[PDB]
């Protein structure tokens, strides 16, 4: 199966100057959980901002740069390449990837940040008519997680 995994605010902002405008450990913990034992696909400029890759899951990068051959990471160069990848595959960003993939994924896992942050990169608009709300869970807030957030699981009708 093919899923989107994203965190966006109330105006679908996802990043500002190449990092997440917010910091929310519980999203990261939530993000962390589902990814384990699966494939993750990202645009070069997303991987760039992480540098250090994630343990215990197949990290794949999409770039047209054949020249890049960075240690311990699989490379692809087109969308077709994605179709030919076993197991459960996750689209993790960034924008230009989400834009391309939103109409191809089976379901979506969205953390909705209940706020309005300044951003320069966005998640594509989408209507609930196309999307069965399979689940909706309010995130708990403590001292380390100060921002209201909702974990959604949207499935295409
Ligand atoms: N809130 C969230 O859940 C997340 C937010 N972000 C945010 O996203 C922002 C980055 O967004 P964006 O600029 O879109 O970054 P991307 O990682 O999506 O960079 C896009 C790159 O992917 C490659 N690419 C995309 N499509 C193709 C294709 N069809 N064929 C070959 N290569 C392709 C290109 O690389 P190349 O030119 O080398 O070929 C392109 O430059 C950051 O600000 C970051 O903070 C990122 C992930 C998650
Ligand atoms: C090292 O672990 C990361 C750290 C950051 C990071 C943070 C949290 C703050 C400042 C700068 C950076 C680079 C970003 C990520 C990216 C890959 C992601 C993601 C993502 C998340 C967090 N949630 C949902 N739902 N989808 C997502 N694709 C991973």
Curated annotation (Swiss-Prot):
Any single Gene Ontology cellular-component annotation: cytosol
Phylogenetic classification of the source organism: Bacteria, Bacillati, Bacillota, Bacilli, Bacillales
Chain sites annotated for binding substrate: 5-6, 27, 49, 57, 92
Binding, NADP(+): 6-7, 14-19, 43-46, 62-65, 92-97, 100, 121
Pathway: Cofactor biosynthesis; tetrahydrofolate biosynthesis; 5,6,7,8-tetrahydrofolate from 7,8-dihydrofolate: step 1/1
Gene: folA
Domain DHFR: residue ranges: 1-156
Note: There are two DhfR isozymes in S.aureus, this one is chromosomal and is sensitive to trimethoprim.
Identification of the protein by name: Dihydrofolate reductase
UniProt KW Metal-binding keyword: no
Enzyme class: oxidoreductase
EC numbers: 1.5.1.3
Organism from which the protein derives: Staphylococcus aureus
Recorded catalytic activity of this chain's protein: (6S)-5,6,7,8-tetrahydrofolate + NADP(+) = 7,8-dihydrofolate + NADPH + H(+)
Function field: Key enzyme in folate metabolism. Catalyzes an essential reaction for de novo glycine and purine synthesis, and for DNA precursor synthesis.
InterPro entries per record: DHFR, DHFR-like_dom_sf, DHFR_CS, DHFR_dom
The keyword Oxidoreductase belongs to this UniProt entry's keyword annotation: yes
A Pfam family: DHFR_1
GO molecular function terms attached to this record: dihydrofolate reductase activity; NADP binding
Keywords attached to this entry: NADP, One-carbon metabolism, Oxidoreductase
């Amino acid at each position: 199966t093919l899923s989107i995994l994203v965190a966006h605010d109330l105006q679908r902002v996802i990043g500002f100057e190449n990092q997440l405008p917010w910091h929310l450990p519980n999203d990261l913990k939530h993000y962390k959980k589902l990814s384990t034992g699966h494939t993750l696909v990202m645009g070069r400029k997303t991987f760039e901002s992480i540098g250090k890759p994630l343990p215990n899951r197949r990290n794949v990068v999409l770039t047209s740069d054949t020249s890049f051959n960075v240690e311990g990471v699989d490379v692809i160069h087109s969308i077709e390449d994605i179709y030919q990848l076993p197991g459960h595959v996750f689209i993790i960003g960034g924008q230009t990837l989400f834009e391309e993939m939103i109409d191809k994924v089976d379901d979506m896992y969205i953390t909705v940040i209940e706020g309005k942050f300044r951003g320069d990169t966005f998640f594509p608009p989408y209507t609930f008519e196309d999307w069965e709300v399979a689940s909706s869970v309010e995130g708990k807030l403590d001292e380390k997680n100060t921002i209201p957030h909702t974990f959604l699981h949207l499935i295409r009708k």
